[PDB]
């Protein structure tokens, strides 16, 4: 019996995969317990329509996420109103909200969850390195300035 898998299933395939299987396995287990469906042509077209529409959403999201990655390197330097203590140490700190809100209202609509700092929250006056995740795998960098209020 050709069937198309719903949830991922051991030794067969992942969601969407097409596989041949013994009828009794499909009939008495995989189908009732919602793990697969027959390989009717309407159904395989359903999923081919699905694979391609999903492929388009992944190509275009990548077209949107790349666009913002060109824009991150486009600004390439940012200022933040930062009350800097004596010697150089910030009375406060510059978080992802602080960085995010600078660049959103300065061009690129970056949410704070996208901002990625290593150790620091930035407690010093100076110019800093900040990288970002805008897609699962496309990343870019701005540089951050700290002007003493």
């Amino acid at each position: 019996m050709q069937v198309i898998l719903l949830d991922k299933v051991a030794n067969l395939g992942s969601l969407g995969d097409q596989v041949n299987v013994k009828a009794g396995y499909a009939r008495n287990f995989l189908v009732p317990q919602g793990k697969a469906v027959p390989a009717t042509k309407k159904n395989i077209e359903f999923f081919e329509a699905r694979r391609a529409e999903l492929e388009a959403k992944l190509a275009e999201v990548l077209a949107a996420a790349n666009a913002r990655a060109e824009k991150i390197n486009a600004l390439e330097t940012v200022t933040i109103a930062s009350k800097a203590g004596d010697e150089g140490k910030l009375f406060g700190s510059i978080g992802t909200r602080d960085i995010a809100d600078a660049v959103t209202a300065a061009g690129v609509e970056v949410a704070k969850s996208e901002v990625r700092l290593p150790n620091g929250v930035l407690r010093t006056t100076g110019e800093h390195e900040v990288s970002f995740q805008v897609h699962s795998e496309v990343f870019a960098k701005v540089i951050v300035n700290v002007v003493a209020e």
Binding site: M1, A23, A26, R27, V31, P32, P38
Partner: protein
Amino acid sequence: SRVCQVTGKRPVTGNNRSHALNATKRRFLPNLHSHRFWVESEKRFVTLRVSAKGMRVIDKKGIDTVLAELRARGEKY
């Protein structure tokens, strides 16, 4: 009776033929099994008296389609 609720297959008659071509009347019975089908749309199992052939019809069409045939036929399940 020995009747498939899906295909209508039922006993048919015919001959045993010997080597010397003696005909004796016989029957050919369908290959029937009572089987419990999970019907999703009714959160329930339906037990059908089905020939194995009838099982393959249900794999092909889906139990929902085949039960719909049972209704239209007036047959209850």
